[PDB]
């Protein structure tokens, strides 16, 4: 008699623990669709007298945040207007750590820029240089 109950025990469970996995599956589906997206769009013009991005970053996800960014292969840091809003906006935000006299040189040339997102994903930025 106990092969039967045995055999009925370990179907319910087979059955519960599948139902748990595939509900899983879908769920980390949902999670990752609506995981954000960042892009960007438009030019950024970055200012050389103190250092302050315009970037036009349009995003279609959760409400991410920058965490840095890399200017000339250095870890700068990022204060400002951090928090990523959903939808496209203007974004006023300040770079740090770079020496004002480098930068200044190059007004009115182009550099290309990466914002440090917290979702795990960089962004790549095309910039103006200007005073």
Known sequence: LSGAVTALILVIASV?????????????????????????????????????????????????????????????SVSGQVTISAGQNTYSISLGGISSSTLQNLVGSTISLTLQ???????????????
Do not use: D, Y
Request: glycine share 16%.
């Open 117 to 131: 997102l917290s979702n795990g994903q960089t962004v790549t930025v095309s910039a103006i240089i200007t005073s």
């Open 16 to 76: 519960i623990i599948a139902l748990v996995v595939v509900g899983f599956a879908f769920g980390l589906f949902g999670a990752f669709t609506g995981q954000g997206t960042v892009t960007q769009v438009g030019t950024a013009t970055l200012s050389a007298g103190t250092g302050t991005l315009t970037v036009t970053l349009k995003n279609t996800g959760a409400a991410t945040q920058v965490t840095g960014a890399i200017i000339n292969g250095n870890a700068a």
